[PDB]
Design an enzyme around this catalytic site. Structure first.
Site, mmCIF file in Angstrom:
data_model
loop_
_atom_site.group_PDB
_atom_site.id
_atom_site.type_symbol
_atom_site.label_atom_id
_atom_site.label_comp_id
_atom_site.label_asym_id
_atom_site.label_seq_id
_atom_site.Cartn_x
_atom_site.Cartn_y
_atom_site.Cartn_z
ATOM 1 N N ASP A 181 0.871 -1.242 -0.014
ATOM 2 C CA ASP A 181 -0.058 0.066 0.075
ATOM 3 C C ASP A 181 1.016 1.333 -0.037
ATOM 4 O O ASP A 181 0.636 2.209 -0.612
ATOM 5 C CB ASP A 181 -0.872 -0.075 1.205
ATOM 6 C CG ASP A 181 -2.384 -0.693 1.091
ATOM 7 O OD1 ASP A 181 -2.592 -1.180 -0.159
ATOM 8 O OD2 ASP A 181 -3.130 -0.268 1.907
ATOM 9 N N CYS A 215 -2.227 0.904 -13.571
ATOM 10 C CA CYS A 215 -2.328 0.833 -12.084
ATOM 11 C C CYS A 215 -3.374 1.796 -11.679
ATOM 12 O O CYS A 215 -4.494 1.594 -12.394
ATOM 13 C CB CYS A 215 -0.967 1.322 -11.504
ATOM 14 S SG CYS A 215 -0.030 2.677 -12.298
ATOM 15 N N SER A 216 -3.409 2.534 -10.600
ATOM 16 C CA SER A 216 -4.419 3.633 -10.513
ATOM 17 C C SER A 216 -4.495 4.709 -11.363
ATOM 18 O O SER A 216 -5.227 4.905 -12.240
ATOM 19 C CB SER A 216 -4.377 4.046 -9.190
ATOM 20 O OG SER A 216 -5.611 4.669 -8.918
ATOM 21 N N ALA A 217 -3.245 5.550 -11.530
ATOM 22 C CA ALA A 217 -3.171 6.495 -12.744
ATOM 23 C C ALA A 217 -2.490 6.265 -13.791
ATOM 24 O O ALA A 217 -2.647 6.925 -14.966
ATOM 25 C CB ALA A 217 -2.084 7.463 -11.957
ATOM 26 N N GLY A 218 -1.779 4.975 -13.871
ATOM 27 C CA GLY A 218 -1.263 4.467 -15.138
ATOM 28 C C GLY A 218 0.049 5.187 -15.367
ATOM 29 O O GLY A 218 0.831 5.334 -16.659
ATOM 30 N N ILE A 219 0.957 5.695 -14.369
ATOM 31 C CA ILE A 219 2.300 6.290 -14.701
ATOM 32 C C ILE A 219 3.346 5.788 -13.626
ATOM 33 O O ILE A 219 4.675 5.631 -14.015
ATOM 34 C CB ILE A 219 2.308 7.749 -14.647
ATOM 35 C CG1 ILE A 219 1.653 8.196 -13.031
ATOM 36 C CG2 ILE A 219 1.428 8.284 -15.612
ATOM 37 C CD1 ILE A 219 1.612 9.620 -12.952
ATOM 38 N N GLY A 220 2.965 5.437 -12.375
ATOM 39 C CA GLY A 220 4.128 4.865 -11.295
ATOM 40 C C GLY A 220 4.480 3.437 -11.681
ATOM 41 O O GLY A 220 5.592 3.154 -12.146
ATOM 42 N N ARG A 221 3.814 2.523 -10.776
ATOM 43 C CA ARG A 221 3.989 1.034 -11.116
ATOM 44 C C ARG A 221 3.917 0.778 -12.539
ATOM 45 O O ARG A 221 4.700 -0.196 -12.963
ATOM 46 C CB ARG A 221 2.961 0.241 -10.235
ATOM 47 C CG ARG A 221 2.761 0.662 -8.800
ATOM 48 C CD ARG A 221 1.631 0.060 -8.214
ATOM 49 N NE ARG A 221 1.358 0.472 -6.703
ATOM 50 C CZ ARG A 221 0.510 -0.039 -6.146
ATOM 51 N NH1 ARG A 221 -0.297 -0.989 -6.175
ATOM 52 N NH2 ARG A 221 0.308 0.750 -4.937
ATOM 53 N N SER A 222 2.985 1.286 -13.352
ATOM 54 C CA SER A 222 3.005 1.034 -14.698
ATOM 55 C C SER A 222 4.265 1.375 -15.446
ATOM 56 O O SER A 222 4.818 0.850 -16.446
ATOM 57 C CB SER A 222 1.627 1.559 -15.490
ATOM 58 O OG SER A 222 0.593 1.127 -14.998
ATOM 59 N N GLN A 262 6.843 7.835 -10.069
ATOM 60 C CA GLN A 262 6.308 8.847 -9.426
ATOM 61 C C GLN A 262 7.143 9.172 -8.172
ATOM 62 O O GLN A 262 6.689 10.512 -7.882
ATOM 63 C CB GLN A 262 5.065 8.380 -9.031
ATOM 64 C CG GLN A 262 3.899 8.550 -9.945
ATOM 65 C CD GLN A 262 2.537 7.999 -9.517
ATOM 66 O OE1 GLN A 262 2.316 6.967 -9.306
ATOM 67 N NE2 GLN A 262 1.686 9.278 -9.217
#
Length: 284
Positions: A181, A215-222, A262
């Protein structure tokens, strides 16, 4: 410079925040006018994360062709990816329309539906074989065929049917279920194992349309997923693998979608994943 020495140098000097802010300063800025039109407000999860106009995926409809999704086209590595936000209640039909129209084989999901006690994306696939989903706005049907639950990820086989033509296609859903998390994983081992499972399926290969990753925003984990994959492929392809420059590859990817990676912790984690993954690429 061998990234492994660059890594120890940054780590000993504790300058990860400085490196990361340099990337933010040099990153491309292109217009995102379509994302900001008033008619598209309920199609965006976050006001400050938008696709650039020049690289956005267009839906094949005359009404409104907008989805928060971008095509990342890596020319030397010969890989393409679609990076998108987690679908919203009003965009689940658009999401599966894009998978259909772009001829994708795989969907890669790097978040849980609820994290930190809040919803991070819609429940956009069926959880039981006998309870299929119908998306009336885009005329698609989605059925769960099978599910394989492992300790760190789940893989699902899905059937997507275009109800207008009765064509069907098999889609593979690769769901990494253990990203914490807060923060990043302590070891990259399970994330790399997951990447190799996606590769082994064919979902990243040129006989199919681009993989869809979110992912949620599509920039960090993605961003971590596609950055690690592309850097490892370049180390395979080049005569001198130590010539691969992860900061340069990240800046190239940021020409196609804003904000990839991010935090400084995600940047360090990306270095670690590539360094550890290379100890298979080079022949072990």
């Amino acid at each position: 410079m061998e990234m492994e020495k660059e890594f120890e140098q940054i780590d000993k000097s504790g300058s990860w925040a400085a490196i990361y802010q340099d990337i933010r300063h040099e990153a491309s800025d292109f217009p995102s006018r379509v994302a900001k039109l008033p008619k598209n407000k309920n199609r965006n999860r976050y006001r400050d994360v938008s696709p650039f106009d020049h690289s956005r995926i267009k839906l094949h409809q005359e009404d409104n062709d907008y989805i928060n999704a971008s095509l990342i086209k890596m020319e030397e590595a010969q890989r393409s990816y679609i990076l998108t936000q987690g679908p919203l209640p009003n965009t689940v039909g658009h999401f599966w329309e894009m998978v259909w129209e772009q001829k994708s084989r795989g969907v890669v999901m790097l978040n849980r539906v609820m994290e930190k006690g809040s919803l991070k994306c819609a429940q956009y696939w069926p959880q039981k074989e006998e309870k299929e989903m119908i998306f009336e706005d885009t005329n698609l049907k989605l059925t769960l065929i099978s599910e394989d639950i492992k300790s760190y990820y789940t893989v699902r086989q899905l059937e997507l049917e275009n109800l207008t033509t009765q064509e069907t296609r098999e889609i593979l859903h690769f769901h990494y279920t253990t990203w914490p998390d807060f923060g990043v994983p302590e070891s990259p081992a399970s994330f790399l194992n997951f990447l190799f499972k996606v590769r082994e399926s064919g979902s990243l290969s040129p006989e199919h349309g681009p993989v869809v990753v979110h992912c949620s925003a599509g920039i960090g984990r993605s961003g971590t997923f596609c950055l690690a994959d592309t850097c490892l492929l370049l180390m395979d392809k080049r005569k001198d693998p130590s010539s691969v420059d992860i900061k340069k590859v990240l800046l190239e990817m940021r020409k196609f979608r804003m904000g990839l990676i991010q935090t400084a912790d995600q940047l360090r984690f990306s270095y670690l994943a590539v360094i550890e993954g290379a100890k298979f690429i080079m022949g072990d």
